[PDB]
Amino acid sequence: EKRKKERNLHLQKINSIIDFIKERQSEQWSRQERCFQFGRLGASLHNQMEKDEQKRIERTAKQRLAALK
Amino acid sequence: MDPQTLITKANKKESWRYDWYQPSKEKYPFRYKTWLRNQEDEEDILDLKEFDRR
Amino acid sequence: FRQDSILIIYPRSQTTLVQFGLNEETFTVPELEIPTQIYRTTRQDGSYTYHSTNKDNKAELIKPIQNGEIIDISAFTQFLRLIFVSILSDRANKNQDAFEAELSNIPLLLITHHSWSQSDLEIITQYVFESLEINNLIQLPASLAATYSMISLQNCCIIDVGTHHTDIIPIVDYAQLDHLVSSIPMGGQSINDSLKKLLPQWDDDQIESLKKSPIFEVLSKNSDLEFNTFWDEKGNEIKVGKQRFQGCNNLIKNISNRVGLTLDNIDDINKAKAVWENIIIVGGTTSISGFKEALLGQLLKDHLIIEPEEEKSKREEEAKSFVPTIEYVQCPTVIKLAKYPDYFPEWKKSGYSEIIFLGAQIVSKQIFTHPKDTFYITREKYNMKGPAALWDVQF
Amino acid sequence: TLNRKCVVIHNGSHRTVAGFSNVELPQCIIPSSYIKRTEAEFIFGTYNMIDAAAEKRNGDEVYTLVDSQGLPYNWDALEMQWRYLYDTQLKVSPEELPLVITMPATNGKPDMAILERYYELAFDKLNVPVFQIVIEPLAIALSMGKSSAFVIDIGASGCNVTPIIDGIVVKNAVVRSKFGGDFLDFQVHERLAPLIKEEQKRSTDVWYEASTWIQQFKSTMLQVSEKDLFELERYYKEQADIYAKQQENNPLVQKKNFLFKPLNKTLTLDLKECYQFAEYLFKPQLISDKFSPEDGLGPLMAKSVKKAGASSPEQVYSLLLTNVIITGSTSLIEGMEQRIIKELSIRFPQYKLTTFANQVMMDRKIQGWLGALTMANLPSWSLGKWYSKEDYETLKRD
């Protein structure tokens, strides 16, 4: 009757709060994982830019003989 | 051109307000300022190349 | 997206760096430096309008940002509109069909400050997606841009030496600890006002020209000569003695004490050592040579973990009768500066005082050239949550 | 979720952590005290506190706000603290956003008076429309993903021991201890006094020394032994004899060095004297004869469980011993987990101990902040008791 409804409400207020706090813990892990992964991708972009531009510096150094003629 | 029609032509839709809100379960006795979704019925141009570092 | 359609705005308390579009070959210096100011015209019935010039001597000059803080968000948003409409007019006058290719979808990257209010950032989030109608927006932290222009180290400290203030922000695990963000009201004007006390006979323009002189360095050839002659703004030659080697010491001691009191509160030692090993010094005053090396030397004088010499000499006198090293467990064992990127041709010539703006162009190549829409608010996200979607795309 | 944004302020014993509900990192972590500069000036903050303590001007008096019972007592200074927070750190009006604050675990009697003071502080002074009061060990146990747990919070004002069953707090087994971080800040200053050439109104220099280098001494130099201190001398030598017999040393002879910055001096302390500070939290009879060993945390671990069993007792015992959560800002010293595990296992050999604890160094100090952060973002208003203005309008009537 009323006691079954009250115990069902207590069990739901326990379980739903535990489930949403576990979902927010999963969000707290996922945000730090996204920050780490995109920070490492941004770090790899600097290596890509160095490999793109140091070759250009070497080509402009190799064209110095043609500039000296 | 006109500064309104330049923004209208460029970059191509709902609105949001910062208003009091009273939640429901029925109605709670409190209100709080939050960003609510708006309903349907709810100048000069500076010339460039002047501050250019040359 | 289209790399010619990228707009980046870096506002400060004095000026604002503006650039629309990338060069697509190398990263270059920004050509537009607009002074951060607005003109409020007092219209009758209580309406407010904002202009670019003084409208018939009826407008008041309002600076929206002072000491890194916004005092008028309605002035700051209309100043962003005053920049954006002028860029639209320039593109429409130069290209005459840019509204389908270069202006059809502009991803805006606005660089924000740490002392700006979250309510003000949500007003900006409202304003960009309602009034400016801009489809994509990143509110980028400047402190994180200062280390994203670097080799992207995980743990560091950012020292932003401004004109009237100096900001100290630690960065741990690619995250900004807001509880240790500090700001002293001592900047380049401290270096000026110290020269007011050292040489009272000079005035504001001569002391500013001494601060902007190439012979103004701090020891940590100019040094062997006692008197050297620099030039004034009007073209007058002025001699100066040893005072050009002074004037920065109070600011360097204040920045060192505040960085020490900031970074000695970090409890984790393995995450705290990499912050002391990666000191990054940014700002407009930091184009003065020797300032960063003098600040590094003051940090090695004050907060370096080293055995004291008055005990090490007694240890050596007891040993002269191999010397073991006293091993401490306190975290600032190594204090070094971060490696500056020495591969940018335009930024090597124009200096690295505006490296936060380069960090914006690098994170724009990260985000705006990829279809991942988890770090910028789209129209679909703005129609669902709006400003509440602002803190779901943050770092 | 709900379209809302809340403000979470955790009033700790030594560190007050204020921030918002939309973020996971706090906006500010200030100390829980103030400086009365003498006109009167209530200095608050984080760095201004340290600067005003380092200037060492006359009249600067550092006054505490949270006693050993966890309850505030200087309400005008707490009002000035929150007016400093919402203007300089939070930068938002308190009328616009809701609030979630915490409550320390009591026995039931001082709850209504602090409820009335929170009503008078949030309604007639800040005009907050609604605020939630959560229980701090319940918040710590519930943010970890548990409904029934056994919370051990090693704080500055003492140790907080709280048995929790099925979401409710067993109040009559809640015994608040005294020996904590404020005790260690006195013991370090008392023991190192002939080595640094030194040895309320004059509490400013004491708090400055406890906040600059004694905290670094706790975070770097100190280590906690997992066993009783004489049993270390019984056990480590017994292991070293087996190692020496298998192959063909005293672990306490390892000299650890502290760099004292106001004099720049190397302080050499061995591992036995490093463990001597950690043994004070569990054996209080080593400094005087008026402190019984029941006053320590060691027998209190069994005493609180035996008092919570009489809220049939063995089911409560097996429910509390398998959900022990170790937390606290001063519990970050290495060995606080293992010492509690061993000291609880030597009095309960039958039941296995499965202790879960947040190993994050930054998040264990703000664990009481995160416990209210998980409560502030709940998608239903009926999941927590949101005290509104009507709850005080009905308290005005008798």
Short mmCIF file of N, CA, C and O in Angstrom, two decimals, chain C residues 87-174:
data_model
loop_
_atom_site.label_atom_id
_atom_site.label_comp_id
_atom_site.label_asym_id
_atom_site.label_seq_id
_atom_site.Cartn_x
_atom_site.Cartn_y
_atom_site.Cartn_z
N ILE C 87 35.55 44.76 -41.57
CA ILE C 87 36.15 43.68 -42.35
C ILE C 87 35.21 43.22 -43.47
O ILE C 87 35.67 42.95 -44.59
N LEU C 88 33.90 43.16 -43.20
CA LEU C 88 32.93 42.84 -44.25
C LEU C 88 32.93 43.89 -45.36
O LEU C 88 32.83 43.54 -46.54
N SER C 89 33.05 45.17 -44.99
CA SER C 89 33.10 46.24 -45.99
C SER C 89 34.38 46.17 -46.81
O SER C 89 34.36 46.40 -48.02
N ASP C 90 35.51 45.83 -46.17
CA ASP C 90 36.77 45.70 -46.89
C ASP C 90 36.74 44.52 -47.86
O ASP C 90 37.21 44.64 -49.00
N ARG C 91 36.17 43.39 -47.44
CA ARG C 91 36.06 42.24 -48.33
C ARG C 91 35.07 42.49 -49.47
O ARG C 91 35.31 42.06 -50.60
N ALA C 92 33.97 43.20 -49.19
CA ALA C 92 33.01 43.53 -50.24
C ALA C 92 33.53 44.58 -51.21
O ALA C 92 33.11 44.60 -52.37
N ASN C 93 34.44 45.45 -50.77
CA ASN C 93 35.04 46.43 -51.67
C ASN C 93 36.23 45.87 -52.44
O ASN C 93 36.54 46.38 -53.52
N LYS C 94 36.90 44.85 -51.91
CA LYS C 94 38.05 44.29 -52.61
C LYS C 94 37.68 43.13 -53.53
O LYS C 94 38.12 43.09 -54.68
N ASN C 95 36.86 42.19 -53.05
CA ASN C 95 36.60 40.98 -53.81
C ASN C 95 35.30 41.07 -54.61
O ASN C 95 35.21 40.47 -55.70
N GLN C 96 34.30 41.78 -54.08
CA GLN C 96 32.97 42.05 -54.65
C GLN C 96 32.08 40.82 -54.81
O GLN C 96 30.93 40.95 -55.24
N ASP C 97 32.57 39.63 -54.46
CA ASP C 97 31.74 38.43 -54.42
C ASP C 97 32.15 37.50 -53.28
O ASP C 97 32.03 36.28 -53.39
N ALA C 98 32.63 38.08 -52.17
CA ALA C 98 33.17 37.28 -51.08
C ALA C 98 32.08 36.66 -50.21
O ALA C 98 32.38 35.77 -49.41
N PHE C 99 30.82 37.09 -50.37
CA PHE C 99 29.73 36.60 -49.53
C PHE C 99 29.33 35.16 -49.82
O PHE C 99 28.58 34.58 -49.04
N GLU C 100 29.82 34.57 -50.92
CA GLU C 100 29.57 33.17 -51.21
C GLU C 100 30.75 32.26 -50.91
O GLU C 100 30.53 31.07 -50.66
N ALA C 101 31.97 32.79 -50.92
CA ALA C 101 33.16 31.98 -50.66
C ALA C 101 33.89 32.41 -49.39
O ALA C 101 34.11 31.58 -48.50
N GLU C 102 34.26 33.69 -49.27
CA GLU C 102 35.08 34.14 -48.15
C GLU C 102 34.26 34.62 -46.96
O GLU C 102 34.80 34.68 -45.85
N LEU C 103 32.99 34.96 -47.15
CA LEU C 103 32.17 35.50 -46.07
C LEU C 103 30.92 34.67 -45.82
O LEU C 103 30.07 35.07 -45.02
N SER C 104 30.79 33.51 -46.49
CA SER C 104 29.59 32.69 -46.34
C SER C 104 29.56 31.95 -45.01
O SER C 104 28.47 31.65 -44.50
N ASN C 105 30.72 31.63 -44.45
CA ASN C 105 30.79 30.94 -43.16
C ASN C 105 32.12 31.33 -42.53
O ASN C 105 33.17 30.83 -42.94
N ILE C 106 32.06 32.21 -41.53
CA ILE C 106 33.24 32.74 -40.86
C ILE C 106 33.32 32.11 -39.48
O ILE C 106 32.48 32.40 -38.62
N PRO C 107 34.29 31.23 -39.21
CA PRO C 107 34.49 30.73 -37.84
C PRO C 107 35.30 31.71 -37.01
O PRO C 107 36.50 31.93 -37.26
N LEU C 108 34.66 32.32 -36.01
CA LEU C 108 35.30 33.33 -35.19
C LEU C 108 36.00 32.69 -33.99
O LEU C 108 35.45 31.80 -33.33
N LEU C 109 37.22 33.14 -33.73
CA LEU C 109 38.00 32.69 -32.58
C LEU C 109 38.32 33.94 -31.76
O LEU C 109 39.28 34.66 -32.06
N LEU C 110 37.52 34.18 -30.73
CA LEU C 110 37.71 35.32 -29.84
C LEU C 110 38.57 34.89 -28.66
O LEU C 110 38.27 33.87 -28.02
N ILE C 111 39.62 35.64 -28.39
CA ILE C 111 40.52 35.31 -27.29
C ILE C 111 40.09 36.08 -26.05
O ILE C 111 39.98 37.31 -26.07
N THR C 112 39.84 35.35 -24.97
CA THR C 112 39.29 35.90 -23.74
C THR C 112 40.36 36.03 -22.67
O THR C 112 41.51 35.63 -22.85
N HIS C 113 39.96 36.59 -21.54
CA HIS C 113 40.84 36.80 -20.40
C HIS C 113 40.34 35.99 -19.21
O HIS C 113 39.20 35.53 -19.17
N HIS C 114 41.23 35.84 -18.22
CA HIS C 114 40.90 35.06 -17.03
C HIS C 114 40.02 35.82 -16.05
O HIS C 114 39.22 35.20 -15.34
N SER C 115 40.14 37.15 -15.99
CA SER C 115 39.36 37.95 -15.07
C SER C 115 38.00 38.35 -15.63
O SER C 115 37.27 39.09 -14.96
N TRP C 116 37.64 37.90 -16.83
CA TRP C 116 36.34 38.24 -17.38
C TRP C 116 35.26 37.36 -16.74
O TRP C 116 35.49 36.19 -16.44
N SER C 117 34.09 37.95 -16.51
CA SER C 117 33.01 37.25 -15.84
C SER C 117 32.39 36.19 -16.75
O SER C 117 32.34 36.35 -17.97
N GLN C 118 31.91 35.11 -16.13
CA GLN C 118 31.22 34.07 -16.88
C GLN C 118 29.90 34.57 -17.43
O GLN C 118 29.49 34.16 -18.53
N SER C 119 29.22 35.45 -16.69
CA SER C 119 28.02 36.10 -17.21
C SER C 119 28.34 36.98 -18.41
O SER C 119 27.57 37.01 -19.37
N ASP C 120 29.49 37.67 -18.39
CA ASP C 120 29.90 38.46 -19.55
C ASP C 120 30.25 37.58 -20.74
O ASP C 120 29.94 37.94 -21.88
N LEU C 121 30.88 36.43 -20.50
CA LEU C 121 31.16 35.49 -21.58
C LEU C 121 29.88 34.90 -22.16
O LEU C 121 29.80 34.67 -23.37
N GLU C 122 28.86 34.70 -21.33
CA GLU C 122 27.57 34.26 -21.84
C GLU C 122 26.82 35.37 -22.58
O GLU C 122 26.07 35.07 -23.52
N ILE C 123 27.02 36.63 -22.20
CA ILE C 123 26.50 37.74 -23.00
C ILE C 123 27.18 37.80 -24.36
O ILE C 123 26.53 38.06 -25.39
N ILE C 124 28.49 37.54 -24.40
CA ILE C 124 29.21 37.44 -25.68
C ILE C 124 28.69 36.27 -26.51
O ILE C 124 28.52 36.39 -27.73
N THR C 125 28.40 35.14 -25.86
CA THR C 125 27.84 33.97 -26.54
C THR C 125 26.45 34.27 -27.10
O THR C 125 26.11 33.81 -28.20
N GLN C 126 25.64 35.05 -26.38
CA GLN C 126 24.37 35.53 -26.91
C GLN C 126 24.57 36.46 -28.10
O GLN C 126 23.88 36.34 -29.12
N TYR C 127 25.53 37.38 -27.99
CA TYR C 127 25.68 38.47 -28.95
C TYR C 127 26.21 37.97 -30.29
O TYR C 127 25.77 38.44 -31.34
N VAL C 128 27.18 37.05 -30.26
CA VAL C 128 27.79 36.55 -31.49
C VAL C 128 26.79 35.73 -32.29
O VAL C 128 26.72 35.83 -33.52
N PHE C 129 25.95 34.95 -31.61
CA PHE C 129 24.98 34.11 -32.29
C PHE C 129 23.62 34.76 -32.51
O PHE C 129 22.76 34.16 -33.17
N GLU C 130 23.38 35.97 -31.99
CA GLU C 130 22.16 36.70 -32.32
C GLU C 130 22.42 37.92 -33.19
O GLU C 130 21.86 38.03 -34.29
N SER C 131 23.27 38.84 -32.74
CA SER C 131 23.45 40.09 -33.47
C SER C 131 24.43 39.93 -34.63
O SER C 131 24.14 40.35 -35.75
N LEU C 132 25.58 39.32 -34.37
CA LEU C 132 26.58 39.13 -35.42
C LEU C 132 26.25 37.97 -36.35
O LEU C 132 26.81 37.91 -37.45
N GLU C 133 25.39 37.04 -35.90
CA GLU C 133 24.92 35.88 -36.67
C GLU C 133 26.07 34.97 -37.13
O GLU C 133 25.98 34.32 -38.17
N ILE C 134 27.15 34.93 -36.36
CA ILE C 134 28.32 34.13 -36.71
C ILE C 134 28.07 32.68 -36.29
O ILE C 134 27.67 32.41 -35.16
N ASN C 135 28.32 31.75 -37.22
CA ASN C 135 27.87 30.37 -37.04
C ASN C 135 28.76 29.59 -36.08
O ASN C 135 28.27 28.66 -35.41
N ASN C 136 30.05 29.91 -35.99
CA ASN C 136 30.98 29.15 -35.18
C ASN C 136 31.84 30.09 -34.35
O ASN C 136 32.30 31.13 -34.85
N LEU C 137 32.10 29.71 -33.10
CA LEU C 137 32.79 30.58 -32.16
C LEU C 137 33.60 29.75 -31.18
O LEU C 137 33.09 28.78 -30.61
N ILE C 138 34.86 30.14 -30.98
CA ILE C 138 35.70 29.60 -29.91
C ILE C 138 36.12 30.75 -29.00
O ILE C 138 36.76 31.71 -29.46
N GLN C 139 35.79 30.64 -27.72
CA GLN C 139 36.32 31.53 -26.69
C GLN C 139 37.61 30.90 -26.16
O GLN C 139 37.59 30.07 -25.25
N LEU C 140 38.74 31.30 -26.75
CA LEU C 140 40.05 30.72 -26.46
C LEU C 140 40.71 31.44 -25.30
O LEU C 140 40.79 32.67 -25.31
N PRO C 141 41.19 30.72 -24.29
CA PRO C 141 42.03 31.36 -23.27
C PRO C 141 43.38 31.76 -23.83
O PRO C 141 44.00 31.03 -24.61
N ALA C 142 43.84 32.95 -23.43
CA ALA C 142 45.13 33.45 -23.89
C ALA C 142 46.29 32.69 -23.26
O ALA C 142 47.33 32.50 -23.91
N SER C 143 46.13 32.26 -22.01
CA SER C 143 47.17 31.52 -21.31
C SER C 143 47.41 30.16 -21.95
O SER C 143 48.56 29.73 -22.10
N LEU C 144 46.34 29.48 -22.36
CA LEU C 144 46.47 28.23 -23.09
C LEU C 144 46.98 28.43 -24.51
O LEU C 144 47.66 27.54 -25.04
N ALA C 145 46.70 29.57 -25.14
CA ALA C 145 47.28 29.87 -26.44
C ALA C 145 48.78 30.12 -26.36
O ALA C 145 49.52 29.78 -27.29
N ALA C 146 49.24 30.68 -25.23
CA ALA C 146 50.66 30.94 -25.04
C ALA C 146 51.47 29.66 -24.95
O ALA C 146 52.66 29.65 -25.30
N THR C 147 50.87 28.56 -24.48
CA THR C 147 51.56 27.28 -24.48
C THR C 147 51.17 26.40 -25.66
O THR C 147 51.88 25.42 -25.94
N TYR C 148 50.09 26.71 -26.37
CA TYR C 148 49.80 26.03 -27.63
C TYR C 148 50.63 26.56 -28.79
O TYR C 148 50.75 25.87 -29.81
N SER C 149 51.18 27.77 -28.68
CA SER C 149 52.17 28.19 -29.67
C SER C 149 53.54 27.60 -29.41
O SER C 149 54.40 27.64 -30.29
N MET C 150 53.75 27.05 -28.22
CA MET C 150 54.97 26.32 -27.86
C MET C 150 54.91 24.90 -28.40
O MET C 150 54.09 24.59 -29.26
N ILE C 151 55.75 24.02 -27.87
CA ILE C 151 55.84 22.63 -28.32
C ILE C 151 54.77 21.79 -27.59
O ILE C 151 54.80 20.55 -27.61
N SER C 152 53.80 22.48 -26.97
CA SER C 152 52.62 21.91 -26.31
C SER C 152 53.01 21.03 -25.13
O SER C 152 52.71 19.83 -25.07
N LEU C 153 53.68 21.66 -24.18
CA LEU C 153 54.05 21.00 -22.93
C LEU C 153 52.83 20.88 -22.03
O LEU C 153 51.91 21.71 -22.08
N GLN C 154 52.81 19.82 -21.21
CA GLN C 154 51.62 19.52 -20.41
C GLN C 154 51.51 20.44 -19.20
O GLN C 154 50.40 20.86 -18.84
N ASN C 155 52.63 20.78 -18.58
CA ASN C 155 52.64 21.56 -17.34
C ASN C 155 53.54 22.77 -17.54
O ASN C 155 54.71 22.60 -17.92
N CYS C 156 53.03 23.96 -17.27
CA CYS C 156 53.81 25.18 -17.47
C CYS C 156 53.24 26.30 -16.61
O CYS C 156 52.27 26.13 -15.88
N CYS C 157 53.87 27.47 -16.72
CA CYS C 157 53.41 28.69 -16.07
C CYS C 157 53.54 29.85 -17.05
O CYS C 157 54.55 29.97 -17.75
N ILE C 158 52.52 30.70 -17.09
CA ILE C 158 52.45 31.81 -18.03
C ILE C 158 52.57 33.10 -17.23
O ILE C 158 51.79 33.34 -16.30
N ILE C 159 53.54 33.93 -17.60
CA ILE C 159 53.75 35.24 -17.02
C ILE C 159 53.48 36.26 -18.12
O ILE C 159 54.27 36.39 -19.06
N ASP C 160 52.36 36.97 -18.00
CA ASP C 160 51.96 37.97 -18.99
C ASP C 160 52.26 39.34 -18.40
O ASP C 160 51.53 39.84 -17.54
N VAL C 161 53.37 39.93 -18.84
CA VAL C 161 53.80 41.25 -18.36
C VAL C 161 53.15 42.29 -19.27
O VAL C 161 53.56 42.47 -20.42
N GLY C 162 52.14 42.98 -18.76
CA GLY C 162 51.44 44.01 -19.50
C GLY C 162 51.99 45.40 -19.25
O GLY C 162 53.16 45.57 -18.90
N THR C 163 51.13 46.40 -19.44
CA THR C 163 51.51 47.79 -19.24
C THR C 163 51.23 48.25 -17.81
O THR C 163 52.11 48.81 -17.15
N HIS C 164 50.02 48.01 -17.31
CA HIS C 164 49.62 48.42 -15.97
C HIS C 164 49.44 47.25 -15.02
O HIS C 164 49.07 47.46 -13.86
N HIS C 165 49.68 46.02 -15.47
CA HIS C 165 49.47 44.85 -14.64
C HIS C 165 50.37 43.72 -15.13
O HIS C 165 50.99 43.82 -16.19
N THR C 166 50.42 42.65 -14.35
CA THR C 166 51.16 41.45 -14.71
C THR C 166 50.40 40.24 -14.19
O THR C 166 50.07 40.18 -13.00
N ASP C 167 50.12 39.29 -15.08
CA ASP C 167 49.30 38.12 -14.78
C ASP C 167 50.20 36.90 -14.64
O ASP C 167 51.17 36.74 -15.39
N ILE C 168 49.89 36.04 -13.68
CA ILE C 168 50.60 34.78 -13.46
C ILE C 168 49.56 33.67 -13.42
O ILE C 168 48.68 33.66 -12.55
N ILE C 169 49.64 32.74 -14.38
CA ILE C 169 48.66 31.67 -14.53
C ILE C 169 49.38 30.34 -14.65
O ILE C 169 50.15 30.13 -15.60
N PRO C 170 49.18 29.39 -13.74
CA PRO C 170 49.70 28.04 -13.94
C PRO C 170 48.78 27.20 -14.82
O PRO C 170 47.56 27.35 -14.82
N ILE C 171 49.40 26.29 -15.58
CA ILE C 171 48.68 25.36 -16.44
C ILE C 171 49.12 23.95 -16.09
O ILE C 171 50.30 23.61 -16.24
N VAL C 172 48.17 23.14 -15.63
CA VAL C 172 48.43 21.76 -15.21
C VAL C 172 47.50 20.85 -16.00
O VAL C 172 46.28 21.07 -16.03
N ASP C 173 48.09 19.84 -16.66
CA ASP C 173 47.38 18.79 -17.41
C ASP C 173 46.51 19.38 -18.52
O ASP C 173 45.36 18.95 -18.73
N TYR C 174 47.07 20.36 -19.23
CA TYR C 174 46.39 21.17 -20.25
C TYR C 174 45.12 21.83 -19.71
O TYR C 174 44.12 21.95 -20.42
#
